[PDB]
Design a protein around this ligand. Structure first.
Ligand SMILES: Nc1nc(Cl)c2cnn(Cc3cc4c(cc3Br)OCO4)c2n1
Length: 438
């Protein structure tokens, strides 16, 4: 089962031509190498991500041209003996000009975060392409030379710093891979061992994913053994770029942040409003660059809050008995969110999820503030509710019994935390929330 492709096949016949980065390239290299990423280990993530993109570009090209498909793989090799770590892909490679002038991303230069020297071999996939070697110690000077024995694609050999030797031990590198790159779109091997088995199902067409995949992934992200009660597969480009799946556990009572199938933060606590912290799943967006995550993250937070509210509302429409169970189990969060919200309009959005018993309905079945209001006739600026220990006492309440042959229907709350929520909300839509007993 041991499968490796990394070996010394490369040789350079002539001497190298020395180049020197410009004022820009000098700033870039310095900032990315020590000022940009907080943890140094993410260089593995960036290079893996680069290798994936190059693999994709070649595959799309061959498939577009109708050509057959070669081995499309990503390989990592650690050498603690030589203090090196190497990553090779068999993707679309690089031309001489690209090796010289170079938006695949900076991500490649993140290597100088842990290396005092980087040695590169690349060969373009286009027929008759030549291979080239690229050398650099990161001092703004790099060398270029035509190389033979270069396989199509790109091979990066990192000569690790004295105190970065940890990334030459397989055990350390394996952990880094499984942490950040477990959903990589192409086969990934480490010292010949296959490492990635999980599929990024959030990138799929939602109507192609089936139940068992959503169950598997839910159990992964939520580290859970039950099943998702609710599943929302949300994809969008207009507001921002968004690839995401949200789950509500079957069980009674966080979301991962990804970008292009690579992990940014396992606990994206700021991605959703605090009251939606019961939601499990993943958010993938190309729009994200630590303790301070908030920036335009908020814009995404607001997008997701609105999409989730509409989701649960739509759920209410199609299924009321299931949603009534959901409201029973998770109402707490909605109430917390309503009392927490600063803007009134946000309060009323979340409040659209609340369900209460009504006087004009059989005891047991619930209604929403909107549903109550629609039937309201010749009624201005009022929503009437009564809080009692139970439906029995609510109906037999003289306060309500007054509304018996009178104008309006009356909502029934049986818990004090529901009444306080209405009091706090004050007005909803065109109407003010008012207690029968004053
Ligand atoms: N794996 C892979 N495949 C391809 Cl097609 C490309 C294209 N750019 N890069 C990153 C990169 C690598 C370099 C470099 C500048 C950059 Br930007 O100078 C030395 O090597 C790639 N990496």
């Amino acid at each position: 089962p041991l499968h490796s492709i990394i070996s010394s096949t490369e040789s350079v016949q002539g001497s190298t031509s020395k180049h020197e980065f410009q004022a820009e390239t000098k700033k870039l290299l310095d900032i990315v190498a020590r000022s940009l990423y907080s943890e140094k280990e993410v260089f593995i993530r960036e290079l893996i991500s680069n290798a994936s993109d190059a693999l994709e570009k070649l595959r799309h090209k061959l498939v577009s041209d109708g050509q057959a498909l070669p081995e499309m793989e990503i390989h990592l090799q650690t050498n603690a003996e030589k203090g090196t770590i190497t990553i090779q892909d068999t993707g679309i490679g690089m031309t001489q000009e690209e090796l010289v002038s170079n938006q695949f991303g900076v991500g490649f230069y993140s290597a100088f975060m842990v290396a005092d020297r980087v040695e590169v071999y690349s060969r373009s996939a286009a027929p008759g392409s030549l291979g080239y070697q690229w050398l650099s110690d990161g001092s703004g000077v790099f060398e270029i030379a035509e190389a033979s024995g270069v396989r199509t694609g790109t091979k990066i050999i990192i000569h690790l710093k004295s105190d970065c030797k940890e990334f030459s031990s397989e055990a350390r590198v394996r952990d880094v891979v499984t942490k950040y790159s477990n959903f990589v779109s192409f086969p990934l091997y480490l010292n010949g061992r296959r490492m990635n088995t999980l599929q990024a199902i959030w990138m799929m067409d939602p109507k192609d994913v089936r139940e068992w995949q959503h169950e598997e992934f839910y159990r992964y992200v939520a580290q859970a053994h039950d099943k998702p009660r609710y599943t929302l597969h949300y994809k969008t480009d207009a507001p921002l770029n968004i690839r995401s799946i949200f789950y509500v556990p079957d069980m009674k009572p966080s979301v991962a942040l990804y970008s292009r199938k690579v992990l940014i933060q396992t606990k994206a606590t700021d991605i959703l409003p605090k009251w939606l912290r019961f939601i499990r799943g993943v958010v993938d967006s190309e729009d994200i660059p630590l303790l301070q995550e908030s920036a335009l993250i908020r814009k995404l937070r607001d997008v997701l809050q609105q999409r989730l509210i509409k989701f649960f509302i739509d759920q209410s429409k199609k299924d009321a008995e299931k949603y009534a169970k959901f409201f029973e189990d998770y109402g707490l969060f909605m109430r917390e969110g309503i009392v927490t919200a600063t803007e009134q309009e946000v309060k009323e959005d979340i409040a659209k999820l609340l369900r209460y018993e009504s006087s004009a309905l059989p005891s047991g079945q619930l209604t929403s503030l909107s549903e109550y209001a629609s039937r309201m006739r010749a009624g201005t600026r009022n929503i009437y509710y009564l809080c009692a220990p139970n439906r029995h006492l609510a109906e037999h309440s003289p306060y309500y019994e007054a509304m018996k042959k009178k104008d309006t229907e009356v909502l029934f709350c049986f818990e004090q935390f529901d009444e306080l929520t209405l009091l706090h909300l004050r007005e909803f839509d065109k109407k003010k929330l008012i207690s029968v007993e004053t």
